[PDB]
Amino acid sequence: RQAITRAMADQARTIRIPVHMVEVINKLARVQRQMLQDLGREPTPEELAKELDMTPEKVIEVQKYGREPISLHTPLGEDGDSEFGDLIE
DNA sequence: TGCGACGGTCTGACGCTCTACACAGTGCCAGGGGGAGATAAACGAACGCTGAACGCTCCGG
């Protein structure tokens, strides 16, 4: 489990994230999911900040860092030739 | 070896803009090494103060 999650931290994401930041973001994700299934609603970032004992600015920074890139080759729709990479200057 | 046929492999499948969008279910902490920022001191520099000192026009008894 240790080696698999270490390689998941160091290799799964294209923009590499250090292992401590990976465990921080997935702990935040799992406690957010727990609060969502308990309260039945999306938890406010302030309550997440108090329950994680971190500052709200740290919480929103963590949510910002927890993203996934989108490929430049995703088609828009019916047309195959018009790409997502040709709409950005 | 000749035979069809069986099968995989491979290719494109008129043109443009007006329009045009985004992407989702399973761990956790302690010990240790580096460099970012604050600290108070340091060797050297030039920055000021000291008016003194040279020289001028100067109103002058």
Alpha-carbon torsion angle A10, A21, A31, A70, nearest 10: -60
- Residue A32, amino acid: Q
Q: A83: which strand partners?
A: A75
Strand B contact with A5 (CB < 7 A) = yes
Experimental technique of record: cryo-EM
Q: Mark out the alpha helices in chain A (DSSP H runs).
A: 2-11, 19-39, 45-52, 56-65
Nearest to A52 by CA among A30, A29, A33, A28: A28
Say how far apart CA A70 and CA A25 lie, in whole Å.
19
CA A66, C1' B9: Å apart? 43
Nucleotide nearest to A86 (CA to C1'): B20
Residue A18's nearest CA partner among A31, A34, A5 is A5
Please check whether residue A63 is in contact with residue A42, taking contact to mean a CB–CB distance below 8 angstroms: no
Torsional sign, CA A32, A35, A41, A43: negative
Q: Decide: CB of A85 under 7 A of nucleic strand B.
A: no
**DSSP 3-state of A56:** helix
Does the nearest atom of strand B lie within 7 Å of A10's Cβ? no
Tell me, in Å, the resolution of the deposited structure. 3.3
